[PDB]
Amino acid sequence: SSILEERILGADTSVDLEETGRVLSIGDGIARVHGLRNVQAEEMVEFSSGLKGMSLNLEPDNVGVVVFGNDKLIKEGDIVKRTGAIVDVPVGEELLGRVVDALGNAIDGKGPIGSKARRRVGLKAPGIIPRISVREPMQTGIKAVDSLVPIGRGQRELIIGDRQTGKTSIAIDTIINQKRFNDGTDEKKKLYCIYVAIGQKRSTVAQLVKRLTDADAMKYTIVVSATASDAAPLQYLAPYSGCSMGEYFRDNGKHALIIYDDLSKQAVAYRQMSLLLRRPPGREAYPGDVFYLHSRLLERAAKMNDAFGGGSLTALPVIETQAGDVSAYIPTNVISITDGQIFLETELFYKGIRPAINVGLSVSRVGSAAQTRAMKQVAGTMKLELAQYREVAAFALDAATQQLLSRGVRLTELLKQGQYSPMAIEEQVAVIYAGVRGYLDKLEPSKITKFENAFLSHVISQHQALLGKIRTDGKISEESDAKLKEIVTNFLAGF
Amino acid sequence: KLFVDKIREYRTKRQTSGGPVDAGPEYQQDLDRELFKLKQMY
Amino acid sequence: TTGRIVAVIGAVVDVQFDEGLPPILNALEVQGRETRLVLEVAQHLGESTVRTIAMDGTEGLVRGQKVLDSGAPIRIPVGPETLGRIMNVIGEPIDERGPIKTKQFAAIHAEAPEFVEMSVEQEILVTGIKVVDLLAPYAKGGKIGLFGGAGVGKTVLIMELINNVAKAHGGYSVFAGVGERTREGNDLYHEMIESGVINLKDATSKVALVYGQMNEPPGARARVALTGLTVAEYFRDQEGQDVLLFIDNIFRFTQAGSEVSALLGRIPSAVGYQPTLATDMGTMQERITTTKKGSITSVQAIYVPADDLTDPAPATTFAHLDATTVLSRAIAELGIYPAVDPLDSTSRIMDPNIVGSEHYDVARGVQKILQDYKSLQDIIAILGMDELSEEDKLTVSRARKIQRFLSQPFQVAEVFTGHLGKLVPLKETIKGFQQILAGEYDHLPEQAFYMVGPIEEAVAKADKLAE
Amino acid sequence: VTYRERLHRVYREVKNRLDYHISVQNMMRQKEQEHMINWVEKRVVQSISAQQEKETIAKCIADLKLLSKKAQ
Ligand SMILES: Nc1ncnc2c1ncn2[C@@H]1O[C@H](COP(=O)(O)OP(=O)(O)OP(=O)(O)O)[C@@H](O)[C@H]1O
């Protein structure tokens, strides 16, 4: 009560001399302003109703200002005040665990964001000298993604697939799995995840935040929600806000991971924003600019060399393809901007094979680089064996052919996984080892899942010393291989 | 000025705070509805 | 002179001068910036107003700034001191090793060579790639195009060509990466440093690099190509030496031109493209020519948007190339690599008087049999192969063997495939395809030919499979 | 097996009896504050109906002097 009265005092009621303009016509989400003589381009003007807008067009007689809210709160004749700073957002480790909207205004309750530094959403990507090749591994905790199509730190993978094929699930598992690194001793393996929700139902993001709080995963995650209802100029801006909150870490020596979900619903917001500016539509009514929109956003997921801090910013854009057409306009626009891709088939998903990665088409163009040596040993064989199995699965003779079929089916059953169940790297190594070396070719395929579960519960309970040996020495030595072979054989015996 | 005005407005309200001041039946009805919702979920 | 900004819409800045205007194509410096922002004039609106395209971010431009005319178009440092350096569109070095200390500068908007200077000599260029050598033999001194969708091989292939051709080359080289990944440019830089092609402590560098990568505004992407053409034109003329000029991706030139052509107030052409698509492409591709003073061998990677070869951009560029090489996603999904489409690749030196008669006959037999198999595919996809004559079954078997044999493992794709990269000499390619067509290998299985070099390796792999 | 279940269940019931109370407290106090502001604003709007306009204008003019001095 008196707390509220202290809330009264200490508020800045000082008045300042500020330049101003008068709105002429608001409609279609683009206000026209008159005046603002000394207004910079891409500046952030502020309307009288607390709204904000980005000074977009500097025409000789007026300023076209895109409103960052609902244009029903803007009259004609209102007053627009320039805040004298290119569109900024608050950055810092004060945002971690906070659900901020596209402009850093906490939509969380939980007080305001106590940030002390601001970045520009319209910054430029690092050049060619600062960057260095991708070296460190980004552990997704998903067997299929971590073995076959690995990811690095600084890479910008893509997750592409249809409605409800488990793209958000892969994103959330990647976010959750980082919990173990974000508790250890060295600040060199800590990953500070970010999650941009663009044009998504608000209830979905609420439940996602609840899930991330169940798994203790909000200590480092920032959720930047520009949900379905929010005006188009906010869904267009949210990715850039998130990318700035990640660039802060990248430029201060830390490691970040940003998940845009989806980028197929930012390009739709941008197409709205453009067609309402009368810009000439192109292919599918998208403006010709709809490439630069994503290229400039995804070119910031860099990996700065050691003379520039050494930080990094992984990116996991999530595209959504109607009827699984990988050759549409936006899917190809983004497939030519990213360093890899993870195709989530909708018929593998409907077969219960989840996560539905289509390993035939998925690829990672840093791939074997930035992969733990142990996983490399175990999973190169899996890659070759799966390749051979795929070559022949179009009909269902000899010993080798049936051997390929059986081993491939076993491996497929082995790569399935459950939600919110990431696995440490050593656990994946152990499972895929028991799968590829051939200690499962007799067990029925239908049982391969049960085995997996049981096997884990054994290895985690009893032989944690071996798993720690694998983790510390990121490689399967000969003695470690022999001990692991003994463990697998003994466990399989009792089955 | 207005900072002092807010200060004194709060003073003269709290002094007439023998409870919730000038609330009305909506006060009790809404509070009871919320409390019963809490009961239903607790 | 000295004008003042009067409008700023996206990357198009309208400026006003009170004294004489600058002629079109000049460069203007925005006085009062924390960096160098060059605006290149493009129109003369009237009222002593010009409309300019900014070659850098135009964020923070206040209506009423001061713009100072340079008097000449964008001029970049050319000469032998650009070898091993990196350059943006406006010619500044972006490799952090100090200024490019040259004697002589070049304007990026020169004119195309006149008709009385074109060379006509045609000669095959051997690349070590089976399909390129056999069906679309590249010409030494002529424009070459790699048409591809997104994720089909344009860059792995242009890197294989870089390796094969350039490392075995005597002349200079230029790589103008326009509108493409930045990490790819960094990897290329650090991969030529380790190959000795670029030298950071000497003057023995052979490659100049120019970069307008995809993070750059539309103004820069639309002009870095001209900077590359200029750096290569110099080595062609003022040295009289054979140049190689790789460009990736030349479709970003026209795409950026169209991004910054709605703002110039033009009526949009067919698919939203600028009305001046064909002429803008022509005035650029017509300076990339071998003439009587030098010889430029240009390899351009053309992107085919949404996998549409009838799109105006590739459809227009098809007329500026000697040899095309249409990489197709349908083949790449079969695992064949390079995905080159044998029945869309063409060349202007597929002449029996240029490549001889055995080469021409083998290439045409390969194309005939592949075309027959393509015609059969419509029936095969439904009535199966059990409904074909015996000659048709034999044709299909040969066609599948040939489709596989065209696939090759590249050196730069070891990290992907693990296999060892192969150069197949031209005679070995002709011999192998001649044998497959004759029928000397109807007993082997298809997969014996998948990802092998000369046919000796095919026979060896067929032996391995038989045990 | 019942041992651990009952041990957890006692914690469940105590924490639920705590949560009911804390949630009721939050709800009632926040609604109280909201009404606080509502009426305080409505009544200060009325209280602005005095005859102090001369003091306000004097303060505004003095602050204008301050701004003018600072802006040159
Ligand atoms: N690995 C998995 N195992 C089992 N079920 C899964 C898995 N991943 C996702 N699902 C299920 O798929 C359904 C939708 O998945 P999800 O929301 O992750 O897909 P999505 O592509 O994000 O959908 P949308 O993009 O439309 O939001 C959910 O019911 C979820 O439980």
Ligand SMILES: Nc1ncnc2c1ncn2[C@@H]1O[C@H](COP(=O)(O)OP(=O)(O)O)[C@@H](O)[C@H]1O
């Ligand atoms: N010769 C090849 N051998 C094996 N794989 C290839 C080959 N060429 C391309 N690929 C695969 O296709 C992908 C296409 O990438 P790339 O060609 O570099 O980009 P672009 O889309 O510009 O062609 C590569 O990452 C690689 O995985």
Ligand SMILES: [Mg+2]
């Ligand atoms: Mg989802």
Ligand SMILES: [Mg+2]
């Ligand atoms: Mg490429």
